[PDB]
Design a protein around this ligand. Sequence first.
Ligand SMILES: [Ca+2]
Ligand SMILES: [Ca+2]
Ligand code: NA
Length: 275
Amino acid sequence: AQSVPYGVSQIKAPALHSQGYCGSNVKVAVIDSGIDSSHPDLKVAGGASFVPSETNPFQDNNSHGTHVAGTVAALNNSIGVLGVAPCASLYAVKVLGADGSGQYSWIINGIEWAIANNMDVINMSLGGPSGSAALKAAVDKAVASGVVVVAAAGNEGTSGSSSTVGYPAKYPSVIAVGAVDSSNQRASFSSVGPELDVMAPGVSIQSTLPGNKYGAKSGTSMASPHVAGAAALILSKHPNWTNTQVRSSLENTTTKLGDSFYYGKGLINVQAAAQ
Ligand SMILES: [Ca+2]
Ligand SMILES: [Ca+2]
Ligand code: NA
């Protein structure tokens, strides 16, 4: 039987599902450690690998990319879990290797690929403490090209009064996502700062794992795909909205939590965001 992860319900996705909105024809790129395309609960449409030693984007030797992807789009069937936008066209853009790290040149190559291939939404569940003119340029171009770019804020917790949001999440053109629990409390690990935009469920998130498995993971990596999946539902309902309108709708209809430095605008509510 299929189980709906708490997080899907928390952001109110099922309401859209009920209306017949599930992300059909929205192209979402998971820029991460690849997606196990053999998983029975996922449907990968395409993708590319930018990791020199791991040329197949459909082999995930880490498990991270597959987990992120099931949050976005685990199929609606009688098995496993359920994604935020279960009918989306899922693309595996492999930029992290088996050890979960990757070079900036690879990540950037992957963003460039996503622009060229007309992805609607990009999910980046990754981040580093330092930026680069090339990294900024690539996210900026995606957004100028009409792509919704979503990134995990980071897992750096609090540090005095400084921002601990990593890159590319720190860039204004990107939506930086922090993590809450099932009670709406900020996860202690969730990165903080003025660049934080929204929150999403990121503690003990059940999703798909390679080799027809399921398991839980915690991190702002798990929070970001709820937002990416949410932008896919919105576009399925309003195919003519610009990335700008999608973003404003998500930000403008959150459930407000505590201070914006810790919670940004609050927890997204896709039901409200979809109008
Ligand atoms: Ca399923
Ligand atoms: Ca921001
Ligand atoms: Na940002």
